[model samples]
Target chain A: VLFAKTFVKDLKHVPGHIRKRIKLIIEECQNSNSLNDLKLDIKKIKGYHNYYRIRVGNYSIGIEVNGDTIIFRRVLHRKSIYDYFP
Target chain B: KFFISRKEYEKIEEILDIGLAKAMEETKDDELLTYDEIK
Candidate 1:
């Protein structure tokens, strides 16, 4: 039941294209047998937005899931953490 | 119930610009500058 109680509108401010991807990821998380079975690693990053990392492939997209919406923040390849804001 | 204080906003913006600039420079991809990526 990913995004189980959430409506798509809850994801406003998110781009239409990435919004679709977020929904898919949410669904994937829900369908998975358990949260432990999910492989996406979420880490809080520096930002006023309370950023969280959403990894897919070799790249990771930062996001902020707050209030009634989800916001895609940034996308970067795994490398150094020096640039992460605090 | 969180708010980005002015100091926090400045820090965030600073790091954002550096990280994003690096991504764009390395990838040479125009799509690196989307709102979702910065917002």
Candidate 2:
């Protein structure tokens, strides 16, 4: 799904403090200029290919690296595409 | 098992920027949800 579209849709349910933290995480990630350099508790998900997870408190921000694109999943606590969402 | 080339720790940052930038609302929603190719 489109990251912003999905993210904004869920913003209504997430706590505002977490919302602010999400923004900071975005800035922190944006500072690197790319995914390869991002090293904030971020790691390639152990069981997934090209998919990675970023930790912001108890929340999960998952992204899949497709070619030159990083497609966002959902703001999860978390899950998997195969239905696990983890 | 299915396998794909493992890109090193380098290209990831750029990918994140693109993703985060998209998440930041800079890219239009229309382009994101549509594509010419299918899997």
Candidate 3:
């Protein structure tokens, strides 16, 4: 039950190391039908519906899930992630 | 002198607060996922 995937434009610009981690996470999501099955630490953003946050060290990723599609919206440092919700 | 009313500033802050709260509430049931930690 893998899902359709999409990424934010900013995802391409993150450091290679961070990008690698993000890819692995996305792969797990693709293989599983339930987000909880991936077991990543995810938190919901306060102002937007369908958006959630996951951490990789000091970096954070924001994503939205719609039916069988997962859209990556933001990839940013922890300090700056909360400044913008994507 | 350039000046803005305190009431106006509070209004802006209030809006921001509401926005953040709404974001959290909307995704309350989303499942948490797992990822590797950077070493």
Candidate 4:
């Protein structure tokens, strides 16, 4: 019962090590019954109704879920993520 | 088929600079943040 498929953008720009971890997370999201199954520390961004951020250590991945798609928007350190969105 | 606007993409890139710099300052190792650590 995977609600939506995940798609990554700017993956090439992501560091190789972090890229692998994100890949694994995306794979889990694609195969899981729900986003909760991924066990990620995900939270909705305040004031950005459609956006969410998943914490991965000191970094965070920005995402948005549409009808049947989960779009990966940004991958950056936590310190700067909120600055861009909030 | 979702598209990111150039303006947004540029903003992301600009912010990434700050992120990268902070990461460099905090950690000398080029290690990825593992799931176990987050969990």
State every prediction's TM-score relative to the real structure.
0.35, 0.49, 0.52, 0.51
Q: Which tens-of-lDDT digit does each residue in A1-86 have in candidate 2? A: 23434544545666788878766655544564354344456767543456666666656666656665655544543222223311
- Candidate 2 segments exceeding 4 Å error: A1-4, A28-32, A35-39, A78-86, B1-39
How well is each residue in A1-86 modelled by candidate 1, as lDDT tens digits? Answer: 21211122224544567666655765564465222324555555553444455554545555445554444434554453245433
The per-residue C-alpha lDDT of model 1 at residue B17 equals: 43
Cα lDDT tens digits for candidate 3, B1-39? 868789997665444444434343444453433333212
RMSD of each: 13.8, 11.8, 10.1, 14.1
- Candidate 3: stretches off by over 4 Å: A1-8, A82-86, B1-39
The C-alpha local distance difference test score for the whole of candidate 4 amounts to 0.53
In model 1, where do residues sit more than 4 Å from their true spots? A1-23, A26-38, A46-49, A79-86, B1-39
Which is the winner by lDDT between candidate 3 and candidate 4? 3
Sum up the clashes in candidate 3.
13
Enumerate the candidates' DockQ scores in order: 0.06, 0.06, 0.06, 0.05
What fraction of the real A-B contacts shows up in model 4? 0.03
Using TM-score as the measure, which candidate wins?
3
- Model 4 over residues A1-86: C-alpha lDDT tens digits? 11111122334446778777876786677576246634777766544356666766666776655566565555665555445432
Docking class for model 3 is incorrect
Interface RMSD of each: 11.1, 10.7, 8.3, 11.3
What's model 4's lDDT at A54?
71
How far off is residue A21 in model 2, in Å? Answer: 1.8
Which number leads on lDDT?
Answer: 3
Interface RMSD of 4: 11.3
